[PDB]
Ligand binder design. Structure first.
Ligand SMILES: Nc1ncnc2c1ncn2[C@@H]1O[C@H](COP(=O)(O)OP(=O)(O)OP(=O)(O)O)[C@@H](O)[C@H]1O
Length: 683
């Protein structure tokens, strides 16, 4: 006889089972180390265990292999070696089986073949294709996660936060990771099939795709580091006219499509957080638990030097040059995986930085490195451990040039490298400070033994000082578009009644330290600091004077130098201010039902003293819309005037979904907004 077979279902109950339902559209997607249904339909005759002998087989790489774990064929039994296939039932003409993949099977697209020998002839042919992803729900996988909610937050959650602003005033920008949005997966696989490791050796690369640590390095680096074939092209000068302001993006989904759609050409402008964000989009898609992290006062781009020196004129103005400033904040991601290539005990959060930084040789990116490693000072652990360490533990010394020879060391108690290291909370919208996962508490013994495995025992504070302290105070929150005051707060806990020189300089900065022109300055050369008192000196920062050179990050750096001629003492104090953007009102009109119209009304009230022209509202959100939505406000919005507009959306998936929006205009760019929306049953 001869086996028939007129069908081959893959079911969607597989999607729900492998937490890949959304990803399950016209092509089965599953997660390794777990079994999936597979019903077979034959015509007339069913399966005859007697005479019929069918064996399965699957290949993945463009150059499969039994030995390279990129190809494997296996018997069909009802017993149970990893790559198995067994009969779970069979009736009428149908024959439902259950295949099982290893918990280390390489990820990618597989071709499922069927070997039928209804005696000696039989027929051998394909059954279909499927995408195997990292399984975080499988204990045997290297990315396993015990906590269910953590699995949700770090793998399935499509919306999220990226922390910006300042350490003294953190700001949470909404982001649409949309890793399960149509096409995004396929663009991810492509992203892998076009990296060096793969072109240099398709088999080798396609094989190693069973390692989260390998895949992580590949993805991370395919974002920027070596744009020989990357996804985003960096740009920091602040002239993005022929592309998209890095601050304008509100989700990786569009950048990825803009990438493939333009024949894999680096997309027009992005920056460290944009890299980290799409990186998170990529890894999450593939199944590796990832979360984007933010670090304030990051000693980035330094060659890794755990010691940085700056030389300033008699105004505290970093006379330096060629020297890199400390970043207001720098972003990278963290990925959850085991490290079967390191002295056990280093499983967990691996820090991956998709931002290239001039290194002790050339220009590439870093990670993955165990965070627990960066905490211990185990700078020898594989994958740029030294950089991530200085990124968080660099030391800084501010020298002030003597207008008559050498420089004099100054006291700058207002700077700290590695501040409020943050990332979104698991299952909530609050922020989670994970600074404790990188550094031991100051003073502690663990901190001393750590700075020792790192030879960073450069920390013997000048707890003596000369009886004075200074810090910059802002009073209250200041908004983008107005004037406001900042203060140089001088404290004098001494019997002496000094006379100083206080130099105050404010300047608009970019998120990475690139100082622009001064937007406010005051210099008092005969400041009287009466005994045991405190003096407060004002600095008026005018809109009219910082509006021209402000970046989309609304950052302005205030600097103050207090000079005491007598004992010849220099006290330095700087602070980065964040000008608050106008809020975006969001109303959800109608009933949030699945596969049903939905309307979103968004308003914004022009905060500037001048009108607003070419105002644009852009909306996105995996679960609320398939495509981005943009509306253009035809006429200008005068100084007082508010802007309002509605956008018809068609939620397709139920559950929770965060709607991210971005407002653009000629004088007010990249102001963000977002709204949590619960989509229920249509009925
Ligand atoms: N850069 C900033 N942008 C907007 N608001 C800020 C900023 N920095 C501080 N604020 C706000 O100012 C108020 C007080 O903050 P904070 O106490 O840190 O500053 P300060 O009180 O002026 O200085 P200090 O507390 O050392 O005397 C809060 O509303 C805080 O959010």
């Amino acid at each position: 006889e001869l086996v028939l077979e007129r069908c081959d279902l893959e079911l969607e109950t597989n999607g729900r089972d492998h937490h890949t339902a959304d990803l399950c559209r016209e092509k089965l997607v599953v997660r390794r180390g777990q079994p999936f249904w597979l019903t077979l339909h034959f015509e007339g005759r069913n399966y005859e265990a007697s005479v019929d002998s069918l064996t399965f087989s699957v290949v993945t790489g463009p150059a499969p292999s039994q030995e390279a774990g990129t190809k494997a064929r296996f018997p069909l039994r009802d017993a149970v070696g990893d790559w198995t296939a067994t009969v779970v039932d069979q009736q009428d003409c149908t024959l439902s089986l259950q295949l099982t993949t290893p918990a280390n099977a390489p990820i990618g697209l597989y071709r499922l073949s069927l070997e039928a020998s209804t005696g000696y002839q039989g027929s051998s042919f394909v059954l279909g294709h499927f995408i195997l992803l990292f399984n975080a729900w499988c204990p045997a996988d290297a990315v396993y996660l015990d906590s269910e909610e953590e699995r949700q937050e770090y793998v399935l959650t499509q919306q999220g936060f990226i922390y910006q602003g300042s350490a003294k005033f953190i700001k949470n920008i909404p982001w649409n990771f949309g890793q399960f949005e149509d096409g995004i997966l396929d663009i991810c696989l492509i992203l892998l099939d076009v990296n060096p490791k793969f072109l240099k050796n398709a088999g080798r690369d396609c094989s190693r795709r069973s390692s989260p640590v390998y895949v992580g390095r590949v993805g991370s680096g395919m974002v920027n580091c070596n744009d020989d074939q990357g996804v985003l092209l960096g740009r920091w000068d602040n002239n993005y006219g022929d592309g998209v302001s890095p601050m304008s993006w509100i989700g990786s989904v569009d950048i990825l499509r803009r990438w493939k759609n333009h024949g894999c050409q680096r997309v027009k402008y992005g920056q460290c957080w944009v890299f980290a964000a799409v990186a998170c989009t990529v890894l999450r898609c593939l199944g590796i638990p990832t979360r984007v992290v933010t670090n304030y006062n990051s000693a980035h781009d330094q060659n890794s030097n755990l010691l940085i020196e700056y030389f300033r004129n008699e105004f505290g103005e970093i006379q330096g040059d060629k020297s890199e400033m400390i970043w207001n904040f720098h972003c990278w991601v963290e990925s959850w995986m085991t490290r079967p290539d390191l002295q056990p005990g280093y499983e967990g959060w691996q820090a991956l930085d998709p931002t290239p930084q001039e290194k002790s040789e050339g220009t590439y990116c870093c990670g993955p490195v165990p965070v627990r490693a960066i905490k211990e000072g185990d700078l020898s652990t594989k994958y740029d451990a030294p950089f991530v360490f200085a990124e968080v533990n660099a030391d800084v010394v501010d020298w002030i040039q003597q207008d008559d020879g050498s420089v004099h060391k100054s006291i700058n108690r207002s700077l700290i490298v590695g501040l409020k290291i943050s990332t979104k909370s698991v299952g909530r919208d609050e922020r989670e400070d994970i600074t404790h996962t990188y550094k031991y508490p100051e003073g502690s013994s663990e901190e001393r033994e750590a700075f020792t495995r790192a030879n960073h025992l450069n920390k013997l504070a000048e707890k003596e000082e000369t009886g004075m302290a200074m810090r910059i105070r802002v009073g209250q929150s200041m908004n983008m578009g107005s004037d406001f005051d900042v203060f140089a707060h001088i404290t004098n806990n001494t019997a002496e009644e000094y006379v100083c020189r206080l130099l105050l300089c404010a300047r608009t900065v970019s998120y990475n330290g690139i100082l622009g022109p001064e937007c406010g300055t005051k210099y008092l050369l005969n400041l009287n600091l009466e005994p045991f008192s405190e003096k407060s000196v004002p600095l008026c920062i005018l809109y009219e004077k910082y509006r021209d050179c402000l970046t989309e990050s609304n950052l302005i750096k205030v600097r103050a130098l207090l000079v005491e001629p007598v004992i010849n003492s220099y006290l330095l104090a700087e602070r980065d201010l964040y000008l608050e953007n106008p809020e975006i009102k969001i109303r959800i009109l109608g009933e949030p039902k699945q596969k049903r119209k939905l309307v979103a009304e968004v308003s914004l009230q022009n905060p500037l003293p001048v009108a607003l022209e070419g105002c644009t509202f852009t909306v996105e959100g995996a679960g609320l819309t398939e495509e981005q939505k943009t509306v253009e406000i035809p006429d200008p919005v005068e100084a007082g005037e508010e802007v309002k507009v509605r956008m018809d959306l068609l939620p397709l998936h139920m559950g929770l979904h965060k709607l991210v929006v971005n407002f653009e205009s000629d004088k007010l760019k990249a102001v963000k907004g977002f709204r949590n929306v619960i989509i229920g049953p249509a009925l």
